[PDB]
Design a protein around this nucleic acid. Structure first.
Lengths: 386, 68, 134
RNA sequence: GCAGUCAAGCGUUCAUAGCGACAUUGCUUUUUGAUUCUUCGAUGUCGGCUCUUCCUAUCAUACCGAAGCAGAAUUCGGUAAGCGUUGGAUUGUUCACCCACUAAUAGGGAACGUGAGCUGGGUUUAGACCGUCGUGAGACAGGUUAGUUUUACCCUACUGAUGAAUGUUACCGCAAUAGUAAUUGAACUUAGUACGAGAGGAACAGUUCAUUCGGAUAAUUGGUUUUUGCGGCUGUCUGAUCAGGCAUUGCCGCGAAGCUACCAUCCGCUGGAUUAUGGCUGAACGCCUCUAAGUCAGAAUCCAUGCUAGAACGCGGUGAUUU
RNA sequence: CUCUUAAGGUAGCCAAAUGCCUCGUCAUCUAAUUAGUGACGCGCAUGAAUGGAUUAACGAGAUUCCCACUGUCCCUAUCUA
RNA sequence: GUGAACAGCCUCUAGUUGAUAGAAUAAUGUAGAUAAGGGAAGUCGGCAAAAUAGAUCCGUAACUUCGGGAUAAGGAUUGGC
């Protein structure tokens, strides 16, 4: 009767059931609506969250006290090694949705996807697509037949992309595989983009640009079984309470004479698949630049990687986004950078960047330097020397 | 920008990477980290702290630069 | 009311029950916060003030003709480490405020101490009455 | 407790803008009663704390009508419970009054929700005191003070986690169904403009910010420290030295990694049908009429988009399928 | 002056562990106090060894305020066995 | 031995090493700790915890049964050679 002081619900009912996701790789539960007046391009890309660092830049938001002034914002890095296409896929339209028809593949599929489709590589015979692959020994009859059947049907089409994981310093010899839906017009152009890209790689450099908005789809960090307060921020009970205080007191009333779903019980915090949106890109670079840490304003030769290396990862020697701020999942985790489902009219999506400076310093310490050059310039001759 | 210097060590201070401390009158101090901040609060003496700029500049240690 | 603009978020450090030093020449020595002007509500959440926030407070140490009544006030210094977008984390050594009317005019004629930029930029009279700033 | 009806009269004039007497019809069960059907081989009987949900007879937020509405502010009313509905002083309190912020500080239900969840301040065991009553024992919805709060391992429910059987095994997917979450204010400009005799004093559009809520994240800042990582210090033992042990982690400074904070940071969508309401055409009724047909817009509404799970007996596709 | 019946509350003391009406009325403390303290008193029903009034020291007694102090709390977090 | 000291802490003599054990290291607990800024707003109630704490020196009110209050309060110092 009449909770004395009305206060608001703890936690979000929509993001239930806070259970473990079916896999580390997060599905894409919807895709950008197609504009059949463009070339075919992917609607997403795959990469690995790698960490963060501290970029500095200037603002261009009139209205601000910090207009035209420097700001120390936060950026997360995604290693986006170019991902290779090894299949396409059909989807016909039904009163039950986009039902599949074929999943067609290339020929010389790597050991990586062959590994994905096993669990015990070294003592298996490594025999996955042997016969579908020998079917290329002909002119490619059924290959092109189903290509044609998909040209006919397949109200939707998806290229199948596997990552070039052997690049990144990870010790996972297996490459994550997934679909990416195509949103040009011209179904012929769709499939032929696919086909010309069979066994070919693609990079974000062809899909994303500066000052553009993406969305991040991944799995939450794993925190195990965890209790009610921290899962829902529920108020800790006092010190005087018999039998624990990291609890909830009234888990329900007498009538309805059960316990409702609406109630904060202990359980699993983490390994949830989450979809964060409207994250603006700040820089899209490659492996060659020795001096990404050198910018328009910085010339000191130093790339994006900070001293000593990223923590828990190893070093970026491949393509990369630095995108704004917080992006679900922890380091080493697969991530999908999808692009949006609508236009920003924020002025904030569109306040572009002129980057100025980066910390390239050891996040494994309190780095006070940027280069070993600077390091020696600052201290100098060591009792070790020459 | 201006790479500030640590008021206790003179080590160099990029943006975000530390703190400012307004003394109660107006005297500013910049700190790279909670380390130098805690030393400052403990009221410790850099000219005796064996390892900062203001230590060796006092001590004529390894400058080897003023006679060039 | 009467503010010269808006306010960017700032780490909160002066809850209710707090006592800060008065940094004007009104004739006070302490300022005891009891409310805050914005102070959006919540269950068992104490109203908090921060640099440049107007509050209501009272005197515990000062004049007999000054204590024992409520008066609006304004914060000028705050030992609660906060952040400016330029990455400098900064904090004063103390916590300090001033007395005022609903419009943002002090009862004072000067200050004894440094001041916060946000309070200065948002409260022009306080800036005027300020000497050194930060 | 709340609502209606008729209309004497107030409301300068004027029954009905707002009110509303004499009367009268009702509703509810958030008051107290009346009854004693259940239960006295036992339902743990005050309040608060914490937590979820629900209702509308809506306090505010959204959209509208009306005015004794010029503007502002306000009052009456309609859709509407989607989102909110405070910090405190005294009190055991519910209640109550005050302070103050507020957009607002609405009423309530759930065995007068909530004691195998707490507390136990009060009430209500025995102890003790006072006053009055009583010859007296002792009494007193009279006052005061001290006074053990038991058990879940069972079923269910819930929250999370596995799982046989579907020819096997692996990979990519669909999406029935269920849930759903965003809210609120201020400043600048608007504009000192409209409006007004002036006093005063708006709104829309648009920009920047913020509160409440939520979901993630650790670059920075901060907090944490058995990295027992570096150093120092005390006491004592190892003959001294170095290097070491014990002091239930010996203490102190620092302290990465990791975990976490509105103590940090990032982010939090747009499309359709509708309410009231206002209108089109338009008779019924040869005029009129937003309606009877039909139709337009329109809300924090509903439903979609999107977001979460993925039916363990819903489904598809694809690959390998035993010297 | 007188009735009750024998006398008619003296000194002191109070909304007190005793005061219904009651959160008594005044002041003070306080932003705000049914708390506390100091005063008032036709006191339902104070009170003189059924002891009254007071009182230094002492009190694991009850109560109020103040300073320091703080995870009690705003608001949680983290570590160890 | 430290130290005022049979306190507490370590140790020689003597005696024990006996209280089911192994692997992990989730919530929740029990016990022990630390915490920004503020500082009882929490709470019936500052319950619990934190602060102080030895020794030397200075300084030490009200009230008083002149004995006390008093370690009052309140300040400074302390290491080793």
């Amino acid at each position: 009767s009449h909770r004395k002081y009305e206060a608001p619900r703890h936690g979000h009912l929509g993001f239930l059931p806070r259970k473990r996701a079916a896999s580390i790789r997060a599905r894409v539960k919807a895709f950008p609506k197609d504009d059949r007046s463009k070339p075919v391009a992917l609607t997403s890309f795959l990469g690995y969250k790698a960490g963060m660092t501290t970029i500095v830049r200037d603002l261009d938001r009139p209205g601000s006290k910090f207009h035209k002034r420097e700001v120390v914002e936060a950026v997360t890095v995604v290693d986006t090694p170019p991902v290779v296409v090894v299949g396409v896929v059909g989807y016909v339209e039904t009163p039950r949705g986009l039902r599949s028809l074929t999943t067609v593949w290339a020929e010389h599929l790597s050991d990586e996807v062959k590994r994905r489709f096993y669990k015990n590589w070294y003592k298996s015979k490594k025999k996955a697509f042997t016969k579908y692959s020998a079917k290329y020994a002909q002119d490619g009859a059924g290959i092109e037949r189903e290509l044609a059947r998909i040209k006919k049907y397949a109200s939707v089409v998806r290229v199948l992309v596997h990552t070039q994981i052997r690049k990144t310093p990870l010790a996972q010899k297996k490459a994550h595989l997934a679909e990416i839906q195509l949103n040009g017009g011209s179904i012929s152009e769709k499939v032929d983009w696919a086909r010309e890209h069979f066994e070919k790689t693609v990079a974000v450099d062809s899909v994303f640009e500066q000052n553009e908005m993406i969305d991040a789809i991944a799995v939450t960090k794993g925190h195990g079984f965890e209790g009610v307060t921290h899962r829902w921020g529920t108020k800790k009970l006092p010190r005087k309470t018999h039998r624990g205080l990291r609890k909830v007191a009234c888990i329900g009333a007498w009538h309805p004479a059960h316990v409702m779903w609406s109630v904060a019980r202990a359980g699993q915090r983490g390994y949830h698949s989450r979809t964060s949106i409207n994250h603006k890109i700040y820089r899209v670079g490659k492996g060659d630049d020795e001096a990404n840490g050198a910018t328009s304003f910085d010339r000191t030769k130093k790339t994006i990687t900070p001293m000593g290396g990223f923590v828990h990862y190893g070093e970026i020697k491949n393509d990369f986004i630095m995108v704004k701020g917080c992006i679900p999942g922890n380091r080493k985790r697969i991530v999908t950078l999808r692009k949006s489902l609508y236009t920003n009219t924020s002025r904030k999506a569109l306040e572009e960047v002129s980057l100025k400076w980066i910390d390239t310093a050891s996040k494994f310490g309190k780095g006070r330097f940027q280069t070993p050059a600077e390091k020696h310039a600052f201290m100098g001759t060591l009792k070790k020397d020459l | 920008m201006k790479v500030e210097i640590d008021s206790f060590s003179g080590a160099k201070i990029y943006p975000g990477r530390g703190t400012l401390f307004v003394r109660g009158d107006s005297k500013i101090f910049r700190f790279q980290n909670s380390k130098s901040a805690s030393l400052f609060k403990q009221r410790k003496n850099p000219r005796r702290i064996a390892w900062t700029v203001l230590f060796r500049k006092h001590h004529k240690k390894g400058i080897t630069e003023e006679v060039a | 009311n009467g503010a010269q603009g808006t306010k960017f978020r700032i780490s909160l450090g002066l809850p209710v029950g707090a006592i800060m030093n008065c940094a004007d020449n009104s004739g006070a020595r302490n300022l005891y916060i009891i409310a805050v002007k914005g102070s959006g509500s919540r269950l068992n959440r104490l109203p908090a003030a921060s640099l440049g926030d107007m509050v209501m407070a009272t005197v515990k140490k000062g004049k007999p003709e000054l204590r024992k009544k409520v008066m609006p006030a304004i914060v000028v210094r705050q030992a609660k480490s906060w952040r400016r977008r330029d990455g400098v984390f900064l904090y004063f050594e103390d916590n300090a405020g001033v007395i005022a009317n609903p419009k943002g005019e002090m009862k004072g004629s000067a200050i004894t101490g440094p001041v916060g930029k946000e309070c200065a930029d948002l409260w022009p009279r306080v800036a005027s009455n300020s000497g050194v700033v930060v």
